[PDB]
Structure 1
Amino acid sequence: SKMNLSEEVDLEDYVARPDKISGADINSICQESGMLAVRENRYIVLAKDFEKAYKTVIKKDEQEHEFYK
């Protein structure tokens, strides 16, 4: 509500995903998307930045070791 979001940014396509992201994760998804929009000197957060940031906060596994599964 305080973030400057482009009209093409439809929040529903991210809230309907089955990933069990927490409220802290949600705030992370928002803040890092805004950060990515800032990096490109853009003053409006686009859906591309939201999708890019959405992939970096839900891939928490990353390291793992592939043999605990």
Structure 2
Amino acid sequence: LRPGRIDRKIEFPPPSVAARAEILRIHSRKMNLTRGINLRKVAEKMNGCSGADVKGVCTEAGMYALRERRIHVTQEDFELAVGKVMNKNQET
């Protein structure tokens, strides 16, 4: 941390619902979705989750939706995926 090795010492927070919600809105953006989806709620569901774990939700909501026979994805899947990723966030 002595500068010249790391000159400008900067710390990356937070994150939180918002970071993820955006990160979610980023990851869910790629995937085809179902309108009426509120990602903040989904991220409000999100707790102890991270931006790569955000992908999990979109994968699980996609897992849901692809299992829903949906390249679209409803909102419910995500919040369901949240808890399911909040599983693995809390699991192991």
User: What TM-score, normalized by structure 1, do the two folds share?
Assistant: 0.71
The answer on 1:55 being equivalent to 2:83 is yes
Q: Distance in 1 between matches of 2:73 and 2:67?
A: 11
The number of residues matched between the two structures is 63
**Which protein has greater RCO, CA pairs closer than 8 Å, 6+ apart?**
1
Q: Distance in 1 between matches of 2:71 and 2:83?
A: 21
How far the C-alpha of 1:47 sits from its partner, in A, is: 1.4
- Unpaired segments ≥5 residues, structure 1: 64-69
Out of 45, 64, 67, which is 1:39 matched to?
67
RMSD: 2.0
Q: Distance in 2 between matches of 1:43 and 1:18?
A: 22
- Unpaired segments ≥5 residues, structure 2: 1-28
Indicate the larger mover: 40-49 or 21-30: 40-49
Q: Distance in 1 between matches of 2:76 and 2:91?
A: 22
Name the one with the larger helix percent.
2
User: What TM-score, normalized by structure 2, do the two folds share?
Assistant: 0.56
Bigger Cα Rg: 2
- Aligned identity (percent) is 40
How far the C-alpha of 1:17 sits from its partner, in A, is: 4.4
Out of 44, 53, 59, which is 1:25 matched to?
53
